[PDB]
A paper describes a structure:
The structure has significant rearrangements in the domain folding compared to previously reported EN structures. To better illustrate these changes, we show the structure in comparison with the EN domain of the homologous LACV, the prototype of the Orthobunyavirus genus, in Figure 2B and C. The TOSV EN fold is organised as two alpha-beta lobes rather than the one alpha/beta and one alpha bundle lobe architecture that is conserved in LACV EN and all previously described bunyaviral cap-snatching EN structures. The active site of the TOSV EN is defined by the H-D-PD-E-K motif, and maintains the canonical configuration observed in other His+ cap-snatching ENs.
Crystals of the apo form grew as small bars in the presence of 2 mM MnCl2 that diffracted to 2.4 Å. In the apo crystal asymmetric unit, each molecule incorporates one Mn2+ ion (Mn1) in the active site with real space correlation coefficients (RSCC) of 1. D90, residing in the flexible loop between αb and αc, is displaced from the manganese coordination site and shows high B-factors (above 94 Å2) compared to the low B-factors (<40 Å2) shown by the other highly ordered catalytic residues. K145 is located in helix αd, and forms one hydrogen bond to the water molecule that coordinates the manganese ion. Four sulphate ions are found close to the active site. Since there are no cap-snatching EN structures in complex with RNA substrate available in the PDB, we explored the possibility that some of these sulphate ions could mimic the path of the TOSV EN RNA substrate binding. Finally, a fourth sulphate ion (SO4′), outside of the proposed RNA binding path, forms a hydrogen bond with K145 amino moiety. The amino acid sidechains involved in hydrogen bonds with these sulphate ions are conserved among Phenuiviridae ENs, with the sole exception of T131, further supporting that these sulphate ions are located in an RNA binding site (see alignment in Supplementary Figure S5).
Residue numbers in the entry: 2 to 204
Amino acid sequence: ERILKKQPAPVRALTIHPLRRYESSIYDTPIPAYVIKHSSDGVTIDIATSELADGQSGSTIQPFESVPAQNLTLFKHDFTFGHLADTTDKKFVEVFGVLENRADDSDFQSPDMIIETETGHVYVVEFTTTMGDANSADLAARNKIAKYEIACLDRSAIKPISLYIIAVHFNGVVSNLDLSDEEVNEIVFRFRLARDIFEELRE
Ligand SMILES: [Mn+3]
């Protein structure tokens, strides 16, 4: 019997912490070799994680990956963020139910994460990437906020919601989470490696 579920109600409202610019501080760090091979559905990838130093950016990377042909278009986004959450089609409706009598489009939106805690807060987290610079990243982040703000606002009447964004570019992250340098480095490092792999995969 979980006692945190027995607290007085929290304020039902949408919270958005301000976005911040972070920059990677990677420098000369080995980038693992990868071997791409044709497979039955798509490609197999073999990442030489042995080449990485202990305590260096990239320690979250797994040596082996299967990418089916239907998943190559999402590979960059999903690989980049694969240490924080696995791919999902978990919709708003699974967590809040339909909002007024009738189901609508915002019920079937699927942000990258929807976390609900015992205390009754809900956290919506969305990841994204850009091939441009930090300004591109800031803009990408604002577009994800615009994509999901309405659905979050209406449902915050049911449980309070905090909306978070992580937007990666080649040299940093725009995010309203409070990230360490290692955490920024890991995201960027995984993004840079995903870019290299993706250019050979589209080919
Ligand atoms: Mn995303």
